[PDB]
Amino acid sequence: VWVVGMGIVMSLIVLAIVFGNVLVITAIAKFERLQTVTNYFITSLACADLVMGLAVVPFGAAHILTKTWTFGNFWCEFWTSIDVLCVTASIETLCVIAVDRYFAITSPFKYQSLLTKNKARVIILMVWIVSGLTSFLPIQMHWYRATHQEAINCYAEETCCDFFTNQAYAIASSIVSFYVPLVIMVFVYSRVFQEAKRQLQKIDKSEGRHKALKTLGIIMGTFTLCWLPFFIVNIVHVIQDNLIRKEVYILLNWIGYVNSGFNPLIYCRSPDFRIAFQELL
Numbered sequence: 001v002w003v004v005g006m007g008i009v010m011s012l013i014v015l016a017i018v019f020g021n022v023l024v025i026t027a028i029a030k031f032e033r034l035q036t037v038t039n040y041f042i043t044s045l046a047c048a049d050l051v052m053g054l055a056v057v058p059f060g061a062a063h064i065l066t067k068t069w070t071f072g073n074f075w076c077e078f079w080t081s082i083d084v085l086c087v088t089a090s091i092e093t094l095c096v097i098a099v100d101r102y103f104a105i106t107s108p109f110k111y112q113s114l115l116t117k118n119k120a121r122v123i124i125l126m127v128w129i130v131s132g133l134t135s136f137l138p139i140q141m142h143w144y145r146a147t148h149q150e151a152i153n154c155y156a157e158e159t160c161c162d163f164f165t166n167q168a169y170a171i172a173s174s175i176v177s178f179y180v181p182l183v184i185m186v187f188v189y190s191r192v193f194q195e196a197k198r199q200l201q202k203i204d205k206s207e208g209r210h211k212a213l214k215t216l217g218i219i220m221g222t223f224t225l226c227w228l229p230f231f232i233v234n235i236v237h238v239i240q241d242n243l244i245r246k247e248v249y250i251l252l253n254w255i256g257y258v259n260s261g262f263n264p265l266i267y268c269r270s271p272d273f274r275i276a277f278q279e280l281l
């Protein structure tokens with residue numbers, strides 16, 4: 001009396017994510033005015049979110065709704081690697097989108113030298129290859145297996161499929177994928193806010209007859225609320241045993257996946273993007 005209802009909501013999530021991603025990608029592709037050296041990162045983020053929505057959510061929904069995996073043992077390592085790759089790529093793309101804006105605000109005269117047409121391609125290939133180095137390599141070669149008697153059968157059994165990681169690969173992946181982008185964002189956005197406050201003070205002193213707080217607050221809060229608890233609990237259950245159950249872990253993992261849907265709404269707000277979206281329909 002409850003399986004039917006949840007499926008509708010999860011399918012709506014899938015539809016919203018895919019619709020937003022496709023709309024952003026086609027808006028960037030069709031119109032020449034939107035092409036900019038700082039818009040390639042948006043394209044990469046949209047592609048990563050679309051890959052997440054197309055190859056991550058449906059399999060998880062099928063696994064959750066149905067009793068058993070009902071697929072081969074080979075596909076589980078592919079699915080987990082795809083999830084890890086997509087999450088890491090999204091996080092690092094967000095970090096780059098923060099870094100280039102910090103460079104633009106801090107030093108405007110030399111902003112042209114730092115970012116060029118070829119630089120975006122190089123940085124995107126580098127960031128994606130770093131994301132893929134930690135996804136396929138340590139999973140496809142079975143470097144993350146655990147020594148516990150529990151889940152040894154799960155590795156052996158083709159029907160069972162759930163995440164069980166060693167002590168290293170959990171903390172190492174968390175450090176690589178979450179904490180460094182968070183620190184970089186915090187520092188650069190604090191500096192940007194300081195510069196904006198100084199400029200506002202100067203103009204208010206010049207003209208003898210806020211607003212950035214809302215933007216910075218939403219930008220930081222969406223990401224933090226979406227991705228903070230999952231990595232904390234990921235660290236803790238490996239640090240100590242019997243700390244959590246599995247249902248809470250799965251629920252936090254699923255609620256972390258909704259971030260990719262909100263990013264197109266959060267990021268594209270310029271009048272040019274609105275005019276383009278109007279021109280689509």
Ligand SMILES: CN[C@@H]1CCc2c(ccc(O)c2O)[C@H]1O
Pocket residue numbers: 080083084087088163169170173174177253
């Ligand atoms: C079960 N899904 C995976 C499992 C572990 C993991 C995820 C995301 C980023 C990481 O760095 C991870 O180690 C999750 O999306």
